[PDB]
């Protein structure tokens, strides 16, 4: 099974998942000098009021907060998108110290962590089916920048003791994912992929320009998770970020510019 270790990490993924060297891999560095304006782009529309969070799960690579996606209760529209996209889950990536951990980077600048809010195109019947299509998924990426303690985030971090090891899950109702958004939805967008195996090239990326905050003390909580299952030898979730991949023949577009 793949991981982030020296012997199963990002550098090795291409063996079991050759699409790792595909034409549209994520994440990427966003060079702000090379970002294009596009009048076809629209403001991002997030409709999360009716969202109902189900549970929080440790899957051995990160942790996920799952949402009810059986109806249009938490949907993403416009931005670069056509149609309706349902929120299925969010999860995080982070690094071993505060100076690194984001997957996307801006002019090479790394944030301490990154939040990925994962959505699927209701044109397909479900998440799994959508993931197999180039227009199937839309992921909103949000940077976590070290500074002030974040009370919204803290609610998530308060649950982590319950899911320390791989396979553990806990009830996590009434979490508003809109509480993990910044107050400006300016974005960069490009066509890409999942940043974890199977690295499917089915994601329209929407990376928010403006980060949310996280304290250094809060960041300590992320790294107390275990990659390993209960009973197995301890391996701390110190880092789980894929590095920047080549942009190749893609163009990053910016809204409002
Ligand atoms: Zn992710």
Residue numbers in the entry: 4 to 260
Direct quotes from the study:
A well-studied carbonic anhydrase II was selected for rational design as it has efficient CO2 hydration activity and could be heterologously expressed in Escherichia coli. Thus, to better understand the key factors controlling halophilicity in enzymes and to develop a halotolerant biocatalyst for hypersaline conditions, we undertook rational enzyme design by selecting just one of several mechanisms present in halophilic enzymes: increasing the incidence of acidic residues on the enzyme surface. Herein, we describe for the first time the successful redesign of a mesohalophile enzyme to an extremely halotolerant orthologue, that is, one that is active at 3 M NaCl and above, by altering 18 surface residues. In contrast to suggestions that large differences in accessible solvent area, non-polar surface area or absence of large hydrophobic amino acids are the important features that allow halophilic enzymes to function optimally in high-salt environments, we have found that increasing the number and distribution of surface acidic groups alone is sufficient to impart this characteristic.
The conversion from mesohalophile to extreme halotolerant enzyme is conducted in stages to assess the effects of substitutions on overall protein stability and degree of halotolerance. Crystal structures of WT and engineered enzymes were obtained to confirm the presence of changed residues, that active site residue positioning was unaffected and also to compare the overall structural similarity of the designed proteins with that of WT. The structures of the four engineered enzymes superposed almost perfectly with the WT enzyme (maximum root mean square deviation (RMSD)=0.42 Å for M4) with no significant differences apparent in their secondary structures. Some of the orientations of other surface residues of M1–M4 were also altered compared with the WT, although none, with the exception of N62D, were in the vicinity of the active site. Up to 18 amino acid substitutions were made to the enzyme surface of bCAII, but this did not significantly alter the secondary structure, catalytic activity or stability of the designed enzymes, compared with WT, in the presence of added salts.
